[PDB]
């Protein structure tokens, strides 16, 4: 028993982290096979970030201008190309530590592990959720650009995120591994705001199931509700509308606990309307939305 | 900016995880050099755990009874010995993936990363604190025994914890890497209770400094206090007494923010007496005590 914000073991990703330098800018790159992926803003200076013309900026750059360092050895760059907001540097050596990998674009509300890096070196790993407004509430500093987000399925690493920027609000924005930003963000030092962020309802429900599984049952009540009545309350509290697909995905947790999804919705409804009354659930005084139903099942069943 | 419960990158520890089987029991082992460390309760059956005589039980065991598997290859056991509550299995092959390592006994209130494992395979990594009552509030299931806790200093892994058992209260107990339990716990299926757990005051203060550093300043007030007045409040709220050493250790954070330690204590005093009034700090509705002043400095400075 016990329930933690658990990240995937990061070893397979650490073996791919490299340092990429261009001019005076240093950030992190992801070395998979003979290709190094990093944010294209590596070619900019502090002046260029105001309104960069990346095609024009990249044109003033040659393979020899990009310095890729893996640990303490230099990689030879034989090709360079821009794909959306990422630079793909072709190196003459394939990464001997390349794990089985896929590039995937996650959906808002899905979770992933982040290996925060500085100078191609990993410093920490944490679990994140892609917010409905496509931002991530991560922990990043200057130099963290190129740090990646991922999921692991037995031996396969699914890369889903590359860190690019911190918005003035403190939240983080980035791209998938093809360089397409999650959300409306652009890689430019201009004031950009994320939309209204909502709470991932299906994830809060999954976490309420984890709480029941772990002995915390105080919030369970003698009431029930309908999808329509529940969603009226969800809209008032800026919670994502619950669909029948969300109910379907909660099926394994509903079967494990013997608590119907709509009965759990009625508990959530009363938690929303009445608050926690100074009590906690799984050690938290607020409703946690950063565990998907898959994460709860995985953590509570022991999927290695 | 941003602040997360960040764990160390776990790669160096994954390369040491092995499966150890004895009779019908399977748990995790830690393979460093030519030695495999695992809980000694691997030699017990469900009947033996009631009141085991480990010396007598180990006597009925030979090197060939302990099956050590690293990935998919079998390790040859040439020696076996019990050191307190751990078995040390001497294998004929030194782990090629052995990182630079130390065995350390952490102090209550200190933090560490846990790589939860099942069948010698890692499934997740999370950050924990050794509670003042020597328990850890981890996330463990049956099969997790032998999972280790550690800290990393550049290239050196300091192993501090090995998981042994879950108490009936749901909290977790284990040993250092010499087999000495943290706390009064014994490796026996008998009702054992942990002491009263207090809040790690110095860690809550360090987290209040992280909150100031990250823009969350609502809780800062026009008041101050003394060590004596503050500790009167700390005792009423089951908070560890704050000593001048704790104030000294908070020095870097005090210097970074320009907020004197006793001024931060006065903010904590009012948070304790008045609650959060429905507000949050760093995304939490309660006072977080699982970040030491070192963790806050590391996370907020980017130590890789
Ligand atoms: O935000 C940037 C630089 C940048 C400016 C404008 C656009 C772009 Cl794409 C990049 N880097 N960055 C990422 N996370 C950080 C956290 C703290 C400070 C800087 C951090
Ligand atoms: O508690 C035990 C078995 C055991 C019984 C008595 C004493 C000893 Cl040393 C070990 N294993 N264990 C550890 N974490 C767990 C979590 C959920 C279930 C079982 C888990």
From Swiss-Prot, chains A, B:
UniProt-reported outcome of changing residue 205 to V: In strain: Zeta/P.2
Primary gene name: rep
Active site location: 41, 145
Primary role: Cleaves the C-terminus of replicase polyprotein at 11 sites. Recognizes substrates containing the core sequence [ILMVF]-Q-|-[SGACN]. Cleaves and inactivates human TRMT1, preventing tRNA guanine(26)-dimethylation of tRNAs. May cleave human NLRP1 in lung epithelial cells, thereby activating the NLRP1 inflammasome pathway. May cleave human GSDMD, triggering alternative GSDME-mediated epithelial cell death upon activation of the NLRP1 inflammasome, which may enhance the release interleukins 1B, 6, 16 and 18. Also able to bind an ADP-ribose-1''-phosphate (ADRP).
Topology Cytoplasmic: residue spans: 1-304
Covalent cross-link Glycyl lysine isopeptide (Lys-Gly) (interchain with G-Cter in ubiquitin), where: 5, 90
Effect of residue 90 to R: In strain: Beta/B.1.351
Subunit structure: 3CL-PRO exists as monomer and homodimer. Only the homodimer shows catalytic activity. Interacts with host FBXO22; this interaction promotes the proteasomal degradation of nsp5.
Catalytic activity: TSAVLQ-|-SGFRK-NH2 and SGVTFQ-|-GKFKK the two peptides corresponding to the two self-cleavage sites of the SARS 3C-like proteinase are the two most reactive peptide substrates. The enzyme exhibits a strong preference for substrates containing Gln at P1 position and Leu at P2 position
Protein name, UniProt field: 3C-like proteinase nsp5
Annotated control of activity: Inhibited by pyridone-containing alpha-ketoamides compounds 13a and 13b. In turn, alpha-ketoamide 13b (tert-butyl (1-((S)-1-(((S)-4-(benzylamino)-3,4-dioxo-1-((S)-2-oxopyrrolidin-3-yl)butan-2-yl)amino)-3-cyclopropyl-1-oxopropan-2-yl)-2-oxo-1,2-dihydropyridin-3-yl)carbamate) inhibits SARS-CoV-2 replication in human lung cells. Inhibited ex vivo by michael acceptor inhibitor N3. Inhibited ex vivo by compound 11a and 11b.
Effect on the protein upon substituting residue 189 to A: Does not affect ability to cleave and inactivate human TRMT1
Domain Peptidase C30: 1-304
Effect of residue 145 to A: Complete loss of 3C-like proteinase nsp5 cleavage
